[PDB]
C-alpha positions in Angstrom: 57.7 84.2 128.0 58.6 85.1 124.4 62.0 86.9 124.0 61.1 88.6 120.7 62.7 92.2 120.2 65.4 91.7 117.2 66.8 94.7 115.5 65.3 98.2 115.0 67.1 100.7 112.8 70.1 100.5 110.4 71.7 103.6 108.9 75.1 102.4 107.2 77.3 104.7 104.7 79.3 103.7 101.5 82.9 102.6 102.6 85.7 100.8 101.7 87.8 98.2 103.9 90.9 97.9 101.7 92.9 94.6 100.9 92.8 91.1 102.6 95.8 89.3 104.0 96.7 86.0 105.2 99.4 83.7 106.2 101.2 81.1 104.2 101.4 77.3 105.8 101.6 76.7 109.6 105.1 75.2 109.7 107.6 76.7 107.5 107.6 80.3 109.1 109.5 81.1 112.0 112.9 83.0 110.9 112.1 86.2 109.6 114.8 88.9 108.9 114.0 92.5 109.1 111.4 93.6 112.0 112.0 91.4 114.9 109.0 92.2 117.2 107.3 95.0 115.0 106.8 91.9 112.7 105.9 89.5 115.0 103.1 91.4 116.3 101.7 91.4 112.9 102.1 87.9 111.6 100.4 86.9 114.9 97.3 89.0 114.0 97.4 87.3 110.2 98.2 83.8 111.1 95.0 84.2 113.9 92.8 85.0 111.0 93.8 81.6 109.3 91.6 81.4 106.3 89.3 84.1 107.2 92.6 86.5 106.5 92.6 90.0 107.9 92.3 93.3 106.5 95.2 95.8 106.3 92.8 98.0 108.4 92.3 95.4 111.1 95.6 94.0 111.3 96.5 98.0 111.7 94.5 98.5 114.5 95.6 95.4 116.7 98.9 96.1 115.9 98.5 99.7 116.7 101.1 100.6 113.8 100.6 103.6 111.6 100.2 103.0 107.8 103.9 104.0 107.1 104.9 100.9 109.2 102.3 98.4 108.2 103.0 99.5 104.7 106.5 98.4 105.2 105.5 95.0 107.3 103.0 93.7 105.2 105.5 94.2 102.4 108.0 92.6 104.2 106.5 89.2 105.2 105.7 89.2 101.3 109.2 89.1 100.0 109.9 86.7 102.6 107.4 84.3 101.3 105.9 83.6 104.7 102.5 85.0 104.3 100.3 85.1 100.9 98.2 88.4 100.1 94.6 87.9 98.9 92.7 90.8 97.0 88.9 90.8 97.1 86.8 90.6 94.0 84.1 92.8 95.4 84.3 94.2 98.7 80.9 95.7 98.8 77.6 94.5 98.1 76.0 96.7 95.6 78.0 96.1 92.4 
């Protein structure tokens, strides 16, 4: 009774994810300023990531907000000094 059957074929294409984001601390954060809900919905997704962090593309999908919005939100929390942005050194493997 062997399971076996693992994998088959893989055809990936060269693509880019973007930038990574993360929340700052887990206590000093709960005042906000600008967006109330539109922002609270973002900080929630970024916070859930913890150390793994969430890409601007991912947090955008779960947030269901357009770049025009996320662009302001991601920048909002930043100025508030509530979150911490993290830039990747090398997204793809083939360097």
